[PDB]
C-alpha cells in the first residue's frame, strides 16, 4: 500500500477529533473530551521540548510535525478501535476505556512511535553520535512503562490496516524488546500483576496475554539455538524448554532486571550439564549472536546481586544454578519433571 499511504492519510487528516469520535465521547458516562484534548496539548509541550532537546532548536519544526501526525494517527486509531469495539461487543458507551489515562498514553505513545519510526533515518540526519533515540525513547518521554505500552501494540496493529510492513515489523520488534527485558525491570507493574496473581486468583488478562507472548518468543529463540547446537540431541530442547518455561513462571524473580535470553542460555547449559552433554557457554554465547535480539552486553554484563554485573557464567554459577540447583537435577532424576507444552501458532 504505497509506502507513503498512511502518512498520506495522516498529512490530509484534521487536527481535531472527528464528529464520530466526539460522538463516542458524548455517550460515555464520564465525558473524556476535555481530558483527551488537554492530554494531547500537555503531552505536546513535553514531547516537543524533549524532542527539540534531542535534535536541537534548528529542528523545532520537525518535533511539531512528528507530534501533529502522531496525534492524527492517535485519533484515527482510537476511532478505528472504538468502532471495532462497538461492533465486537455492541455497547456504544466506552467511558471506562476512554477515561483511562494509561490507555490514552499508550495509544499516543504507540502512534508517536509509528510516525517516529517511519521518519527515523530522516530524523537521524541532523542527529548523529551518541543520541539515537531508538524505541524505548518514546516511553522515556511520556514517563510511560514498557508493560503498559505493550498492551496497545497488537490492537493498534489490527486497528490500522495501512501500516507499512516496515512499521508492522518495528511495532512487533518493540513488543519483543519489552518481552525480553523492558517488562521485567524493577519499575515494571508486571511484578505487581504477578504477585497479585500468585496471591488472589482470577483477573489480569494482560498478564495472561503477556506470558503467552513471552513463552512463544522464548521458545522460538530457544528452538533456534537448539537447531544450531543440539542437532545431535533432539530430546533436549523440550527438556530445556520445560526448565526455561517453569523458571519464568515460578522463578520470575530471576527475571527482575535481567534478560529473557540470560535465563534461556542458562537453561540450555544447565540441562545439558545434567544430561551430560558438552555445550560450553563459549559455544552457546557464540550461537546466541545469531538471534535478532542478540547483543554481547546480554551475556557479558549480567545482573548478579546488587548493582553488581558480571559474565553470564557468573550469573549461572552464583545465582541461576544456585537458585535452581535441585530443579535442574530433577531432570536427570528417576522421575523427570513433566515436560511443558511447546507454545504454538
Amino acid at each position: 500500500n504505497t509506502i507513503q499511504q498512511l502518512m498520506m492519510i495522516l498529512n490530509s487528516a484534521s487536527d481535531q477529533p472527528s464528529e464520530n469520535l466526539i460522538s463516542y465521547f458524548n455517550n460515555c458516562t464520564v465525558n473524556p473530551k476535555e481530558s483527551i484534548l488537554k492530554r494531547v496539548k500537555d503531552i505536546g509541550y513535553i514531547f516537543k521540548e524533549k524532542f527539540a532537546k534531542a535534535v536541537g532548536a534548528g529542528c523545532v519544526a520537525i518535533g511539531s510535525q512528528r507530534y501533529k501526525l502522531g496525534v492524527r494517527l492517535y485519533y484515527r486509531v482510537m476511532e478505528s478501535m472504538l468502532k471495532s469495539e462497538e461492533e465486537r461487543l455492541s455497547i456504544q458507551n466506552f467511558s471506562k476505556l476512554l477515561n483511562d489515562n494509561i490507555f490514552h498514553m499508550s495509544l499516543l505513545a504507540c502512534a508517536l512511535e509509528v510516525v517516529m519510526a517511519t521518519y527515523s533515518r530522516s530524523t537521524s540526519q541532523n542527529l548523529d553520535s551518541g543520541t539515537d533515540l531508538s524505541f524505548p525513547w518514546i516511553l522515556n518521554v511520556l514517563n510511560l512503562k514498557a508493560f503498559d505500552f505493550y498492551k496497545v501494540i497488537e490492537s493498534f496493529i489490527k486497528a490500522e490496516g495501512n501500516l507499512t510492513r516496515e512499521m508492522i515489523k518495528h511495532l512487533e520488534r518493540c513488543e519483543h524488546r519489552i518481552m525480553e527485558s523492558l517488562a521485567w525491570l524493577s519499575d515494571s507493574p508486571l511484578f505487581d500483576l504477578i504477585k497479585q496473581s500468585k496471591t488472589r486468583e482470577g483477573k489480569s488478562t494482560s498478564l495472561s496475554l503477556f506470558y503467552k507472548k513471552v513463552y512463544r518468543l522464548a521458545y522460538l529463540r530457544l528452538n533456534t539455538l537448539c537447531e544450531r547446537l543440539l542437532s545431535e540431541h533432539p530430546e533436549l530442547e523440550h527438556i530445556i524448554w520445560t526448565l526455561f518455561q517453569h523458571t519464568l513462571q515460578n522463578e520470575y524473580e530471576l527475571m527482575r532486571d535481567r534478560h529473557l535470553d540470560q535465563i534461556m542460555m542458562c537453561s540450555m547449559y544447565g540441562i545439558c550439564k545434567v544430561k551430560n552433554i558438552d555445550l560450553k557457554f563459549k559455544i552457546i554465547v557464540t550461537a546466541y549472536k545469531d538471534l535478532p535480539h542478540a547483543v554481547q552486553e546480554t551475556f557479558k554484563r549480567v545482573l548478579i546481586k546488587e548493582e553488581e554485573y558480571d559474565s553470564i557464567i557468573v550469573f549461572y554459577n552464583s545465582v541461576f544454578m544456585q537458585r535452581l540447583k535441585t530443579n535442574i537435577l530433577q531432570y536427570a532424576s528417576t522421575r523427570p519433571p513433566t515436560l511443558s507444552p511447546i507454545p504454538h501458532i
Partner: peptide, 18 residues
Amino acid sequence: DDYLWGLEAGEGISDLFD
C-alpha cells in the same frame, strides 16, 4: 513472521485496560 497474535477470539483492547 514470528509475531504471536495473542488476543483470543473477540478479546479487543478493552479487555486490556480498565
